[PDB]
């Protein structure tokens, strides 16, 4: 059966019965400059997320951006 809750995780129904789950993955926009992107991106490879695209804002050239979907826990 389907099931909504609970905020404090331990409870949730046994893997005997459990075929679905949800990590309220947001994707976030980070302005950054220049490249911190290499460092950053990989970081967002551990706390796994999802690139859409985004854009360079104009310069300062170190002007730049990134829109990523990552699960709430990993993100924090």
């Amino acid at each position: 059966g389907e099931e909504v809750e609970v905020h404090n995780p331990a409870d949730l129904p046994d893997p005997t019965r459990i075929e679905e789950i949800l990590e309220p993955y947001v994707k976030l926009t980070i302005f950054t400059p220049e490249e911190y992107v290499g460092s950053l991106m990989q970081l967002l490879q551990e706390k796994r997320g999802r690139l859409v695209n985004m854009n360079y804002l104009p310069g300062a050239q170190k002007r730049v951006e990134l829109v990523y979907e990552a699960p709430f826990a990993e993100i924090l």
Binding site: E35, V37, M41, L51, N53, N55, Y56, G59, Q61
Partner: protein, 139 residues
């Protein structure tokens, strides 16, 4: 108002999304980044796919320029043996193949490139592209 360029990349054919590294220096461009999929996948809807390199250069008033090349010897052979992926473990594991002419007709496709104006020299490298993925050449 960003300075001129001399960009050195290596981008594939078809998959043309603004996703990097079509950006980290191609934003130092204001790069007309969708000009790729049009001007490039028009002449190169004749090969099919594969990484065709690109040397783009920006200038003063924020615009670009490039003249690309040709798709891998690991592509033109993959279609001529019914292969997507190579063979996992080359040298011993053969999946599909290519004849002495099917290797010659490929040098035909990538000749305005390398260095040798030979068909005897060029296809060797193509014949060298053979074992590299495990595709056998019929004697």
């Amino acid at each position: 108002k960003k300075v001129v360029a001399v960009v050195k990349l290596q981008l594939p054919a078809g998959k043309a999304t603004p996703a990097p590294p079509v950006g980290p220096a191609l934003g130092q461009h204001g790069a007309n980044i969708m000009e790729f999929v049009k001007a490039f996948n028009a002449a190169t809807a004749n090969m099919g796919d594969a990484i065709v390199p690109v040397e783009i250069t920006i200038y003063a008033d924020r615009s670009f320029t490039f003249v690309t090349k040709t798709p891998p010897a690991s592509y033109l052979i993959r279609k001529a043996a019914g292969l997507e992926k190579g063979a996992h473990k080359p040298g011993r594991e053969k999946v599909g193949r290519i004849t002495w002419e099917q290797v010659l007709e490929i040098a035909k496709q990538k000749m305005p490139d390398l260095n040798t104006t030979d068909l005897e020299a060029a296809a060797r490298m193509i014949a060298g592209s053979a074992r590299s993925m495990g595709v056998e050449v019929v004697g």
